[PDB]
Design a protein around this motif. Structure first.
Motif, PDB file in Angstrom:
ATOM      1  N   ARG A 114       0.846  -1.175   0.000  1.00  0.00           N
ATOM      2  CA  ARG A 114       0.000   0.000   0.000  1.00  0.00           C
ATOM      3  C   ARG A 114       0.889   1.236   0.000  1.00  0.00           C
ATOM      4  NH1 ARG A 114      -5.567   0.468   2.677  1.00  0.00           N
ATOM      5  NH2 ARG A 114      -6.099   2.680   2.567  1.00  0.00           N
ATOM      6  N   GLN A 115       1.993   1.185   0.739  1.00  0.00           N
ATOM      7  CA  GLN A 115       2.881   2.339   0.798  1.00  0.00           C
ATOM      8  C   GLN A 115       3.509   2.570  -0.571  1.00  0.00           C
ATOM      9  OE1 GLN A 115       6.929   3.189   3.277  1.00  0.00           O
ATOM     10  NE2 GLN A 115       5.008   4.136   3.931  1.00  0.00           N
ATOM     11  N   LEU A 116       3.844   1.480  -1.251  1.00  0.00           N
ATOM     12  CA  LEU A 116       4.382   1.569  -2.601  1.00  0.00           C
ATOM     13  C   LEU A 116       3.382   2.315  -3.474  1.00  0.00           C
ATOM     14  CD1 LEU A 116       5.999  -1.971  -3.083  1.00  0.00           C
ATOM     15  CD2 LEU A 116       7.188   0.208  -3.301  1.00  0.00           C
ATOM     16  N   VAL A 117       2.110   1.955  -3.341  1.00  0.00           N
ATOM     17  CA  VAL A 117       1.079   2.544  -4.167  1.00  0.00           C
ATOM     18  C   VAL A 117       0.978   4.030  -3.846  1.00  0.00           C
ATOM     19  CG1 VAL A 117      -1.404   2.648  -4.600  1.00  0.00           C
ATOM     20  CG2 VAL A 117      -0.247   0.441  -4.532  1.00  0.00           C
ATOM     21  N   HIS A 119       2.894   6.080  -2.501  1.00  0.00           N
ATOM     22  CA  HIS A 119       4.100   6.868  -2.722  1.00  0.00           C
ATOM     23  C   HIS A 119       4.531   6.886  -4.185  1.00  0.00           C
ATOM     24  CE1 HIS A 119       5.570   6.764   1.754  1.00  0.00           C
ATOM     25  NE2 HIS A 119       4.432   7.412   1.586  1.00  0.00           N
ATOM     26  N   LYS A 120       3.577   6.668  -5.084  1.00  0.00           N
ATOM     27  CA  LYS A 120       3.799   6.835  -6.514  1.00  0.00           C
ATOM     28  C   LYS A 120       4.989   5.998  -6.985  1.00  0.00           C
ATOM     29  CE  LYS A 120       1.741  11.581  -6.854  1.00  0.00           C
ATOM     30  NZ  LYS A 120       1.380  11.861  -8.282  1.00  0.00           N
ATOM     31  N   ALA A 121       4.997   4.730  -6.585  1.00  0.00           N
ATOM     32  CA  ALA A 121       6.006   3.770  -7.038  1.00  0.00           C
ATOM     33  C   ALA A 121       5.399   2.722  -7.986  1.00  0.00           C
ATOM     34  CB  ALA A 121       6.666   3.083  -5.831  1.00  0.00           C
ATOM     35  N   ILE A 122       4.079   2.769  -8.155  1.00  0.00           N
ATOM     36  CA  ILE A 122       3.361   1.789  -8.960  1.00  0.00           C
ATOM     37  C   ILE A 122       2.641   2.443 -10.120  1.00  0.00           C
ATOM     38  CG2 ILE A 122       1.637  -0.038  -8.972  1.00  0.00           C
ATOM     39  CD1 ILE A 122       4.034  -0.642  -7.227  1.00  0.00           C
TER      40      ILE A 122
END
Lengths: 205, 86, 80, 148, 82
Positions: A114-117, A119-122
């Motif tokens: 969720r943090q990846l999502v 934080h604009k990493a996905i």
RNA sequence: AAAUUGAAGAGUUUGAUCAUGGCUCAGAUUGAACGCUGGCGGCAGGCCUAACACAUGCAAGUCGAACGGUAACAGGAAGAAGCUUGCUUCUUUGCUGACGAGUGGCGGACGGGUGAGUAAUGUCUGGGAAACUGCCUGAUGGAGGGGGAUAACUACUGGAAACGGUAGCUAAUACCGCAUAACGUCGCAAGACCAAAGAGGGGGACCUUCGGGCCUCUUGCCAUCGGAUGUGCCCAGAUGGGAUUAGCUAGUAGGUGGGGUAACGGCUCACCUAGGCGACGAUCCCUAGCUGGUCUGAGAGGAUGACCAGCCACACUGGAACUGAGACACGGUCCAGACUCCUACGGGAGGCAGCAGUGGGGAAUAUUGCACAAUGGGCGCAAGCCUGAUGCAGCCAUGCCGCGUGUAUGAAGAAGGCCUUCGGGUUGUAAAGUACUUUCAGCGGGGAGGAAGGGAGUAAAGUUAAUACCUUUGCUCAUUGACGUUACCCGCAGAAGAAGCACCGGCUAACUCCGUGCCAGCAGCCGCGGUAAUACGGAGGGUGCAAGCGUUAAUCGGAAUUACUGGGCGUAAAGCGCACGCAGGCGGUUUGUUAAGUCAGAUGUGAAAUCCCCGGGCUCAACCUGGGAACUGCAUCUGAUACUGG
């Protein structure tokens, strides 16, 4: 809007592993897994019919990281949709981006995914999606964006992933850090000690 | 009135009112002459009076002081009655 | 195109007028029983040919008085 | 700009300076009547403007709580001060008054002078000092207990 | 008189127009006689964005309905598109 | 393909039971408020109370291409000069770009506000016939020749102001005759009668009184018959309650005739008849805007009529008409009332239920903001001007939706707290430590779309004497965003700035210790509290929610507890003490007939939005949107004739 407290408490209350940590460790070496939290954890709940329904719904919610309002709305949609409501509920959960990111192994946990999502990493279809509850569709391609590709979390995440059972409905290329949501998972794809009909019962009364 | 044009409109409508009043009073006069002849039993006076009245109920219709239909009834009505006597 | 009503003469007293009653059955909106309802119409009867009790055919027309917007078409049955 | 006076808060609707009906800007020198505040503030106090009104709402309500807490505090003391169920002597007879003055500066100031004329024999007390005019609940206030 | 024009629906910052025939005095989003097209100024233009029943527009013009500056433009634009 | 394919029960009367029956809870919903707490964003909502009263600004103007015109500012000019000889300042003159005041035209009947009044000159459904209808539109013809005025202005004069008084004087698309006059009005017909207005753009011979004639096109004006839109009118059904309201009615019901309206009509008047309404609820009394729809319910129902849209009604109160195509006029007029403001005391002025804002009332509801850029309205040939409609911004967690307040690792599992039979359990991988990420907020950098048009030129067509002008359509050039620091994208810093609320006796998810001792107190219902209280109050622990959480208020649900679907009356609430009987409801059996009920089909209508189904667009969602289905209803016609009715 997110549950931020201790996580193994949740597993301990529901009586099962909820995969809220990476899985690097036997969970019983991190907590007293088979005992509820608190002074009276050893106590047994002679648990009412309402009780078993509540705890089952909590279990699923705590697995996917969903609070009540959104989850109720998920039930409403499952109900509106055609076909078995209980199964529709799990399709909707399992189609969430934070979830899919986790299943392709990009995140050690759904919390990490969720943090990846957020934080604009996905990216989805080479387009940046940063909201966790984004519903992913057949043939979509979700990928770690170029700049997030060298994050060591992701490599570790893909290693652990390789050691979990491998989901059928996803095609993951670990090298590219991209993956394809081939199809909606069937019911048979998902764990069998989830009792959706209990959750369905809780929300119809 | 409060607004500039509202003031002007009240002035214009008063002028129009005194214009219309004057022409309207005139018209009814010439209508009344015909009914008065009828009530005295004279064909000629009443036909004569009808002939003076005709062009002016027609004209005031054209001029919007009254509608065409009003002019017509007056002519229809008076014509009916005068014929019914002589 | 001759829209029309049928009813019976409840009053023939008035000069050139008549009162006609149109009766019909209607399903009750809530309790389903079929109930009698009556509609009384002031109708025009030039020539006064309609007797009380007569069964008459009437039609809708322009206003003829404060309360008359119907006139007689013809008598159907009379003097029961 | 949002302005906060005492426990009262609000946005300024308009500005008036002396005879002048409207002024666009006001300097530290010349005084300007302020308008648009929620309610009539204290007769005098320190006023400070703020950037946003939302941040100043909790502060204004906080000052009310303290002023209300001391209000109930001073209410409990005066009643319990006698330490008896009634007055020891026959001064129990009193007169009530109801006062509403248009200006906020007077009601606090003249009341102090109105408490100077008070005596042991006959006790006079003010009830429901108003910010201005008159109102339904004020006339009702004088209806319950006989007062001028 | 009768006019053909845009009644602005859609949401804030996302205008969406409904082309309508109406008595010019009625409010813009109020009583109309017939709906006859729509106009999305925010359409992705990958697919559609502007649709006009030109047959009924003309019928109404034939009976003296006037036409907005903006609808007069749409019609020339749509006539050009095909 | 899909598009109502949906329905739960628990606590509480008893020692216990079954039944009866009420009370209470779990659910959805809200224009909410209050208490504690409170980070960001998108979309929506925001005086429910006093149709209480309102300071100030703004909310309706516009056209010089109808008209006399100049007072402002802007140039220009014979001629005065700034003169340092092309730069110029003022005296002058509307010469013109424009334009204050005035006449004139079109708009001030729209847009916006409110729900007081109204149980019907209302609304909804469905039909009728006796009508008008600005602007826009098709058709066919007119657009001739005159006349007397007037505002502005000038002179004199009254007022504190508001605003006047005299006499001059002048224009027009202001106003009135006269002519012309039918596919118009009246009339069986013969006949009789009715209107008007100009203003601009450009121009070839031709020429004058240098104004223009004349040529040409645009535009406005008059008449008549149409179209479209709007509106008026009539009938039927439906649309709240009360009989502790049963009789009501003299323009009353109808007829004749005159008058009247745009038009039918007791609309009005005279005369005549004596009717008309009413238990299928009149009259009277109470209450109330109606609808699409909204909330709830499996449904049938129940409740409801903010926000959006349709109709109506109102505009300080009561009454009135004038102007107008339209009003008995929301920022018009007149009278009366209530109230307020100005005054030099004699006299004047006004009406926020437009948008802000104020006082008042209240538990409670926002800024005296920006912009006409977009859509739309008024005026104008246009340019444009006006537009508190509208687009936007501010305020409030009011609601809906989204996201964050970190992620991972971290053990004898520390200290502290809490419980403990002192063995240990718990808080708790929680914290610290270790790496790691940087959404959002902060800060810099960049940068869509909402923009279509309009303006100069140009070219071609239709025009025409014409390459003018006009208009249409292509071309290029330079331009138009209130929001705005926009959406969105890139960069920098560091976990850094972002967690509270209620509950844990049963109903009901969550238990212990200490304090208190029928006190202090809790309490939705049962019911807790006199020495072990999981029920009071604190603590530790836990449960449920989460930028909210609780309490209160409120509708429906569960409530088959008004029972049409869907209940009861021997002993539980409920058979009138008994009979006769009008109205009413129901009515044995056969034939024929009818075809109102009922049934079938066809056609029209049932606004859009909403709901539902499948799609599309904003990073998702809320939200926006295409198409469908649905609107289970009404009406007309044509049939069927078993059952009900005649």
């Amino acid at each position: 809007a997110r549950y931020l407290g201790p996580k193994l408490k949740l597993s301990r209350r529901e009586g099962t592993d909820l995969f809220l940590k990476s899985g690097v460790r036997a969970i019983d070496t991190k907590c007293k897994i088979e005992q509820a939290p608190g002074q009276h954890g050893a106590r047994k709940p002679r648990l009412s019919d309402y009780g078993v329904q509540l705890r089952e719904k909590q279990k699923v919610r705590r697995i996917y990281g969903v609070l009540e309002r959104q989850f109720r709305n998920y039930y409403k949609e499952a109900a509106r949709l055609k076909g078995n409501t209980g199964e529709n509920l799990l399709a909707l959960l399992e189609g969430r981006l934070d979830n899919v990111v986790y299943r392709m192994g990009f995140g050690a946990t759904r919390a990490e995914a969720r943090q990846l999502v957020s934080h604009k990493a996905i990216m989805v279809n080479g387009r940046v999606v940063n909201i966790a509850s984004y519903q992913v569709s057949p043939n979509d391609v979700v990928s770690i964006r170029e700049k997030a590709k060298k994050q060591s979390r992701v490599k570790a995440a893909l290693e652990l992933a390789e050691q979990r059972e491998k989901p059928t409905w996803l095609e993951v290329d670990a090298g590219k850090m991209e993956g394809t949501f081939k199809r909606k998972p069937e019911r048979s794809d998902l764990s069998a000690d989830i009792n959706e009909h209990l959750i369905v019962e809780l929300y119809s009364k | 009135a409060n607004i500039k044009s509202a003031k002007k409109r009240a002035i214009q409508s008063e002028k129009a009112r005194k214009h219309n009043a004057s022409r309207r009073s005139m018209m009814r006069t010439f209508i009344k002459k015909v009914y008065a002849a009828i009530e005295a039993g004279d064909k000629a006076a009443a036909q004569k009076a009808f002939n003076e009245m005709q062009p002016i109920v027609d004209r005031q219709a054209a001029k919007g002081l009254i509608h065409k239909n009003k002019a017509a009834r007056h002519k229809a009505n008076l014509t009916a009655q005068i014929n019914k006597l002589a | 195109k001759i829209r029309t009503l049928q009813g019976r003469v409840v009053s023939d007293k008035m000069e050139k007028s008549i009162v006609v009653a149109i009766e019909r059955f209607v399903k009750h909106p809530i309790y389903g029983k079929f109930i009698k309802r009556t509609t009384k119409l002031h109708v025009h009867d030039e020539n006064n040919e309609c007797g009380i009790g007569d069964v008459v055919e009437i039609r809708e027309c322009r206003p003829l008085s404060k309360t008359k917007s119907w006139t007689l078409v013809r008598v159907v049955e009379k003097a029961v | 700009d949002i302005v906060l006076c005492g426990f009262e808060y609000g946005r300024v609707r308009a500005m008036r300076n002396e005879l002048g009906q409207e002024v666009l800007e006001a300097g530290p020198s010349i005084p300007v009547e302020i308008l648009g505040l929620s309610g009539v503030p204290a007769a005098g106090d320190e006023v400070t403007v703020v950037r946003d009104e939302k941040k100043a709402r909790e502060v204004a309500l906080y000052r009310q709580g303290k002023f209300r807490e001391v209000k109930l505090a001073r209410q409990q003391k005066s009643k319990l001060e006698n330490m008896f169920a009634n007055m020891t002597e026959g001064e129990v007879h009193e007169v009530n008054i109801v006062l509403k003055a248009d200006v906020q500066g007077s009601v606090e100031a003249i009341s102090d002078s109105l408490l100077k004329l008070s005596t042991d024999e006959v006790k006079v007390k003010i009830i429901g000092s108003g910010v201005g005019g008159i109102t339904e609940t004020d006339a009702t206030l004088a209806a319950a207990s006989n007062a001028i | 008189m009768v006019t053909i024009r845009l009644a602005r629906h859609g949401a804030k910052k996302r205008p969406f127009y409904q082309v309508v025939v109406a008595d010019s005095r009625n409010a813009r989003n109020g009583r109309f006689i017939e709906r006859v097209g729509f106009f999305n100024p925010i359409a992705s233009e990958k697919e559609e964005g502007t649709r006009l029943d030109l047959d009924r527009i003309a019928h109404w013009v034939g009976q003296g309905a006037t036409i907005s500056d903006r609808v007069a433009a749409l019609i020339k634009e749509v006539n050009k598109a095909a």
